[PDB]
Design a protein around this ligand. Structure first.
Ligand SMILES: OC[C@H]1O[C@@H]2O[C@H]3[C@H](O)[C@@H](O)[C@@H](O[C@H]4[C@H](O)[C@@H](O)[C@@H](O[C@H]5[C@H](O)[C@@H](O)[C@@H](O[C@H]6[C@H](O)[C@@H](O)[C@@H](O[C@H]7[C@H](O)[C@@H](O)[C@@H](O[C@H]8[C@H](O)[C@@H](O)[C@@H](O[C@H]1[C@H](O)[C@H]2O)O[C@@H]8CO)O[C@@H]7CO)O[C@@H]6CO)O[C@@H]5CO)O[C@@H]4CO)O[C@@H]3CO
Length: 370
């Protein structure tokens, strides 16, 4: 069902889909071509189903990590932007959208975790992970804790584990080596061990989940937290006086948060590929375009250098980018579902003495490169 002479875009419901529409209206003015933005529930699952049979939308919006699965099944058309369009986005962001050495989507927005702190309790954030244990005792003397984050999820603990050497899969060129996993090196042990210590010296609680670390920061009980752009909305509400800054270093090495890139890909089945290419590169990927979606619902840090510079006037955004420029692009290969599951295990076991650091990581690694 190659609709033809139309544009149909699929975007998640929690995004700036009305702003996106106005861009669509703009397009419709210089072209006569109708745009249509929809936000169907479970679009990330419906896409692969409808597209396998030459259906779905012309363009799909989703975080880049799902795009590798789509591309393996040849659901996404390859893109060919020119060097001069390429130089308009941050370099790092193009590597988020290369599958099998091919460009499969356009990078929109960039997300990464940041260190969020209570300005009131902690007038100056720690620049070191090593210096947090002291801060905790220092702060516990007044009834408050130093830090509180999601420990139940690998996404949240990786920044530290990867700080000194850890990685998921090696990127030596534009391909990921699926047998070269960095969960069992020196660096990962150094970082996981540091984390275990925090739990063992009662500086941290082993069952602290997302909702527990949020409640705590937000009620003013703890002085720091580790969260993303999606979380800001609730703190505003909470009325806390927070700041957002770079992640602490570990052994003098930066924390390595995973990076997620919001991306737009074109259905391999679209008859409208040149139309979509036109709309993306010249209508959406411009200052007036990112601004129109953004006014509807913030995007965070964007990949468009020009607009980034203006957005980065909000220290929360500049910090997100700073963190993403130090982070680890979340690999988009199918093997990643192997890393999650196994890393969630290695960490939980280490944090509850159910297995040492050296035991957990080693069995994690065999599981992954299995
Ligand atoms: O119940 C909650 C959730 O249930 C359903 O989701 C299931 C999902 O469909 C399955 O695919 C599976 O997911 C596993 C996944 O495949 C594994 O790879 C791993 O997940 C990793 C992610 O793939 C990886 O991207 C990363 O994730 C981080 C995100 O990138 C990052 O943006 C952030 O996420 C925050 C969201 O941005 C924010 O909107 C908010 O999320 C709410 C969702 O929007 C909303 O859909 C719903 O989620 C349902 C979902 O609809 C069902 O499909 O509620 C969410 C509130 O929790 O907040 C997010 C932060 O909480 O953060 C994350 C890391 O959390 O890393 C992860 C691994 O660390 O594991 C997945 C299973 O754990 O299973 C889930 C059901 O559990």
């Amino acid at each position: 069902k190659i609709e033809e002479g139309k544009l149909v875009i699929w975007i998640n419901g929690d995004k700036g889909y009305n702003g996106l529409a106005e861009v669509g209206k703009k397009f419709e003015k210089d072209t006569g071509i109708k745009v249509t933005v929809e936000h169907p529930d479970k679009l990330e699952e419906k896409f692969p189903q409808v597209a396998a049979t030459g259906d779905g939308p012309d363009i799909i919006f989703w975080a880049h990590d799902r795009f590798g699965g789509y591309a393996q099944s040849g659901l996404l058309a390859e893109i060919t932007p020119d060097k001069a369009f390429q130089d308009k986005l941050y370099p790092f962001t193009w590597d988020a959208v290369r599958y099998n050495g091919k460009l499969i989507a356009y990078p929109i927005a960039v997300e990464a975790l940041s260190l969020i702190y209570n300005k009131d309790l902690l007038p100056n954030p720690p620049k070191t992970w090593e210096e947090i244990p002291a801060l905790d005792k220092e702060l516990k003397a007044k009834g408050k804790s130093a830090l509180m984050f999601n420990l139940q999820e690998p996404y949240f603990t990786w920044p530290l584990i990867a700080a000194d050497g850890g990685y998921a899969f090696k990127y030596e060129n534009g391909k990921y080596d699926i047998k070269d996993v960095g969960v069992d090196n020196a660096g990962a042990k150094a970082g996981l061990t540091f984390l275990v210590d925090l739990i063992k010296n009662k500086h941290m609680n082993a069952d602290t989940d997302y909702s527990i670390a949020e409640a705590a920061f937000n009620k003013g009980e703890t002085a720091m937290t580790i969260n993303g752009p999606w979380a800001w909305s609730n703190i505003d509400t909470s009325k806390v006086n927070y700041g957002v800054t770079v992640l602490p270093t570990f052994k003098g090495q930066p924390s390595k948060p995973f990076v997620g890139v919001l991306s737009a890909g074109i259905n391999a089945a679209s008859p409208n590929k040149e139309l979509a290419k036109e709309f993306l590169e010249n209508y959406l990927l411009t200052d007036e375009g990112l601004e129109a979606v953004n006014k509807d619902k913030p995007l965070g840090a964007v990949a468009l250098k020009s607009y980034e510079e203006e957005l980065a006037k909000d220290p929360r955004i500049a910090a997100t980018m700073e963190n993403a420029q130090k982070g680890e692009i979340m690999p988009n290969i199918p093997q990643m579902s192997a890393f999650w599951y196994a890393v969630r295990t290695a960490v939980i076991n280490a944090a509850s003495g159910r297995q040492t650091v050296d035991e957990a990581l080693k069995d994690a690694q065999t599981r992954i490169t299995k």
